[model samples]
Target: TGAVPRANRIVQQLVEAGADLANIRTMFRNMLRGEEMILSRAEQNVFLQHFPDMLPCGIDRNSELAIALREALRRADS
Candidate 1:
């Protein structure tokens, strides 16, 4: 399901959140390999502190997934 907006938006958000391009690349790999998982509460709080704009609407499972992908990519790229 690597379709345009869904796939590309994930990448776009990572970049916006200050992720390194190289790390972002690795995250993409992990995602393709299916080695990633959902984000925990602590992790979500940390991410919310760093990039509050990401979850302006609200925070939930789906938002957590988006944040998880963004942070994982940020660490990889940073």
Candidate 2:
């Protein structure tokens, strides 16, 4: 493949994330899915912090996931 790494921080982060998600997906594919991932407040913040990134990926979200994220945050607070 004729690919060269981009010399920008955004692309740098994108490349890192690509590898991270690729590995995660690999594990997911290697295993059979039978349960849901119970994310915690820390996980919620991890996704929420990248809310804008969702827009960049062209998958505009809504209050449903927001509700879930906030609920996770609330559960952690209590």
TM-score of each: 0.35, 0.26
Model 1 CA lDDT for position 51: 40
Model 1 lDDT, full chain set: 0.48
How do the residues 20-78 of candidate 1 rate in per-residue lDDT, one tens digit apiece? 55744553445445544234454444445544654444333244455465555555456
Model 2 stretches with alpha carbons more than 4 Å out: 1-50, 53-62
User: 1-78 in candidate 2: lDDT tens per residue?
Assistant: 111211122223433444243432332223223222233344333443444443234222243443343333333335
Candidate 2 residue-wise lDDT at 70:
34
Off by over 4 Å in 1: 34-78
How well does candidate 2 match the true structure in TM-score terms?
0.26
Best by TM-score: 1
lDDT on C-alpha atoms for all candidate structures: 0.48, 0.33
Clashes of each: 3, 0
Q: Rate residue 61 of model 2 by lDDT.
A: 21
